Design goal:
part of a larger assembly; 8 chains; A: about 270 residues; alpha/beta; 4-stranded parallel β-sheet; 14 helices; about 10% strand; C: about 100 residues; binds 2'-deoxyadenosine 5'-triphosphate; Apoptotic protease-activating factor 1 (chain A); Caspase-9 (chains C, F, G, H); apoptosis; programmed cell death; AAA+ ATPase
Chain lengths: ~270, ~140, ~100, ~130, ~140, ~100, ~100, ~100
């Protein structure tokens, strides 16, 4: 959700946790389609009213604009006048660059486009097509180009559209600067990545020491935690560098070479 | 145990090359029939030729001859498979043998492809009792 | 509900659960939108379902029903002829 | 039950939970043979009308096409006109690589089959037998 | 500073050596009207000064430590500049929406590189160059 | 039943249970298919079985009988000579 | 009770609870040792205590009273002059 | 209550719950301060509220009411005309 909304929740969290009787809120939110049964079961499993409220808010902080509204409405509808009032000024607008765009894409996923750029439509459209051939599977999309040509930026504005991002990839979008690297460095980028992926520390805090287990946790997370979400590599030099990142995921990589798509199985473009 | 040790027939080979160079069988050059015959069924070598002909749509004669002279060094590619060329695989399987036997293997190079041998001749070669040989062979 | 009102409800716990008549109170509570109907059914079933158990759950749950839950609750007491109890409460709020 | 039917139930679940008096529905469904006594006892054990309705719907969501129809019919027969209307459009007709495959087998268990492969049936079948 | 309305963005004041500057910035963010309306996320301050890689790293752990008072994340110390940068971005976005992060006395470019993720910055200094390597709007 | 009709039934709780005559009402309710016969037997046995207890259960259960339960219920009131009560109800619906 | 008999009791639920006369049935049930006396008092108090509520609890509890509970229950029906109901049951068992 | 008295109450469980008349017993229990009034309301609501369920909860809860709960309870039996039951109890205590 918008930062305004989220910060409003954070500011008033303690008041909300103290008063909310979740059984009168979760129902509305489930009806509205913005809370899942498994989230509700996770909430129910907390032993006290305030612990349940705390869990529910934890969950909501991660949701979208509609969800905040769902929550607010249920609060109002269930007579929590004071609590709704606290959340009123934080209500986000609901229903090209839009809310979605800066919402999802500020996750580090993209460097901001430069101060001055002409718009090259002809290519961007092509990339959108090829990338839209997927409908989802594991898959690979490659753009290689002349040394020093406009490329990385071009990719960065490929995933700018709202329509595409919303429909085809509502898992979120990620970005990884790779660059020329060695085994050690690559390993590092791996720990950093898997660390970045889970914000809830749903797994233990520990550091995998081999490339393999890294790869593993990657696949597990990407499949379970972030379904249907695009993982973008930047500037990939060598084959064995690419080997590690490969499990069953969608990848859009930019580079100078056409070869390094060498060692990976699956459809290619 | 299920032995997979067998190898492909003419038809499948044709379909693989088909899907690699994007044609229908009738549109294939004639040399297609010939080259497969020398390929001898291993899905590897098929996958190779079908990989290379993808890049250089006419080298056909070049490989038809180069595969004949029997040298496989000239063929190289990288793919899902772990080794570049056919020779490597064999080369790996060979090395894991004991230090003792590794010499005895080399001797066996004298056979002619398609020539079945009885056991006795080998007894003659290594100069030892029948069963004693038959075990190593096993 | 502010801390002072909450504290008042705890201080008067014994008297409330000893003297509160609930069967006659539900209509009043509804009229002033203090509780939703299902909330009332839940309170009615609290513990053994005796008057005391209902009363106790009522006053506990009351702490969650808003900034004005306490004065509104005193009024409902008044409206149902529980002036003595309402009087005990008010003279504390003021005290 | 068909996904159409199930999604219709899910969409209208809250309305259904608010209004259904289970004692007038479970009887029909038991008579029809599509609700069991033990399910009914599990329902009965919920303390309030809406909690009972909620439990019953939970149970029904897992049942077959006939069951949905049984439910719908009982609703109609017991005067729940509005509720039946909500469920009308969701009534179901009564009387190789798939979802499973990419579901279970993406666990790392298998590398994806190559871009180009001929199908060798004869051997695969044997392995399946053994 | 009010041109922002919020985005990532940069505001720089460079001046003569020894001129009244740092103080001047310190009284920039004094007003109630501005602070309340434009930045109700809170406001932060970091003394940087002339530094090396080690030191910079230190300022980083200290900073990210300062940011989360509820220990919403695990207690551990990131050993590379990168992950530091990461947790910074995550926190600033999630934990402290629309809040101004002020740098003090920033000497070199690569010193600035680390602090850069998607946040608003008001930096004081003597140089106009070191806004060099950062993307986004500048003043 | 929409929320406004439900709310109306709660607001008029005291008057309904004080004044509703039920013994004469059952035929009307049946005629307009507001309740099934067994539902009526259950309502008749509600609580102590007094007129008031029956009345109360009637109006509570009424909330579940459809989108038009309230206007249909007013009509049954009219049909049984409870014009005063029906009148009190209608002038609220409209209000 | 086998599954077929149980299933029969569920299929005939509506007819049983609509038509079963219980007040006259208790002696018969006792004579054939289908229920203990306290079990009968409990069934008598089931729900609202109406004939229908008693009937319903009877037939539910019947499922637990043995392998021959159903045929013995038909006999008690016969013994108390509920031939029509017994007849409806039997022609199913056989069917 | 000593272990021997407790054991006595368990041994006589069946007879107590079969024969104890409770409706007439409450006054006696109060007179000898065996139970507080709310405790009595809770016991009255135990289980289904039948005489047997009340009786059972009474005798279970009795074990907690003091060193002299058993003899005082026998007296209340005597006082309410349940001499036969009191007699069954006493001849055990002594035995
Ligand atoms: N749309 C654009 N408009 C204006 N300038 C652009 C545009 N795209 C690229 N440039 C110019 C300015 C940018 O500073 C510079 C970046 O180009 P870029 O695409 O990043 O090369 P590259 O990084 O992809 O190649 P490589 O990764 O091999 O170095 O090129
Ligand atoms: N409003 C002011 N009023 C009086 N004295 C001031 C004022 N502002 C600055 N000074 C004087 C006294 C202060 O002790 C001194 C601090 O100036 P300052 O702005 O901190 O320089 P500076 O620290 O910003 O430059 P630099 O960081 O390069 O050293 O300057």
């Amino acid at each position: 959700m918008d930062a305004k909304a989220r910060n409003c929740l954070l500011q008033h969290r303690e008041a909300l946790e103290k008063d909310i009787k979740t059984s009168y809120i979760m129902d509305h939110m489930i009806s509205d389609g913005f809370l899942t049964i498994s989230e509700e079961e996770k909430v129910r499993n907390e032993p006290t009213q305030q612990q349940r409220a705390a869990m529910l808010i934890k969950m909501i902080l991660k949701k979208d604009n509609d969800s905040y509204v769902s929550f607010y409405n249920a609060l109002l509808h269930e007579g929590y006048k004071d609590l709704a009032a606290l959340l009123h000024d934080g209500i986000p607008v609901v229903s090209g660059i839009t809310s979605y765009v800066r919402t999802v894409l500020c996750e580090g996923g993209v460097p901001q486009r430069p101060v001055v750029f002409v718009t090259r439509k002809k290519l961007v459209n092509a990339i959108q097509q090829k990338l839209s051939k997927l409908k989802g599977e594991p898959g690979w999309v490659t753009i290689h180009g002349m040394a020093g040509c406009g490329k990385s930026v071009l990719a960065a504005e490929a995933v700018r559209d709202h329509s595409l991002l919303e429909g085809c990839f509502p898992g979120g979008v990620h970005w990884v600067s790779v660059g020329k690297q060695d085994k050690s460095g690559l390993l590092m980028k791996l720990q950093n990545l898997c660390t970045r992926l889970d914000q809830d520390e749903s797994f233990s805090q520990r550091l995998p020491l081999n490339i393999e287990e890294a790869k593993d946790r990657l696949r597990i997370l990407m499949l379970r935690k972030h379904p249907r979400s695009l993982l973008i590599l930047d500037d990939v030099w060598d084959s064995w560098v690419l080997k590690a990142f490969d499990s069953q995921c969608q990848i859009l990589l930019t580079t100078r070479d056409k070869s390094v798509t060498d060692s990976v199985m699956g459809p290619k473009y | 145990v299920v032995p997979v040790e067998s190898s492909l027939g003419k038809e499948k080979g044709l379909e693989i090359l088909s899907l690699f160079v994007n044609m229908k069988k009738a549109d294939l050059p004639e040399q297609a029939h010939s080259i497969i015959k020398e390929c001898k069924g291993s899905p590897l070598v098929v996958s190779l030729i079908g990989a290379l002909l993808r890049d250089f749509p006419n080298r056909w004669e070049y490989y038809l001859k180069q595969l004949q002279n029997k040298q496989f060094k000239r063929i190289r590619k990288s793919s899902s498979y772990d080794y570049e060329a056919l020779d490597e695989a064999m080369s790996i399987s060979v090395e894991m043998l004991r230090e003792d036997i590794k010499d005895y293997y080399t001797d066996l190079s004298i056979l002619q492809k398609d020539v079945k041998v009885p056991t006795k001749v080998l007894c003659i070669l290594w100069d030892m009792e029948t069963e004693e040989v038959e075990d190593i062979l096993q | 509900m502010d801390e002072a009102d909450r504290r008042l409800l705890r201080r008067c716990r014994l008297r409330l659960v000893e003297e509160l008549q609930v069967d006659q109170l539900w209509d009043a509570l509804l009229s002033r939108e203090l509780f939703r109907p299902h909330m009332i059914e839940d309170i009615q079933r609290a513990g053994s379902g005796s008057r005391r158990d209902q009363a106790r759950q009522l006053i506990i749950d009351l702490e969650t029903r808003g900034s004005q839950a306490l004065p509104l609750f005193i009024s409902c007491l008044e409206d149902t002829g529980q002036d003595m109890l309402a009087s005990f409460l008010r003279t504390n709020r003021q005290a």
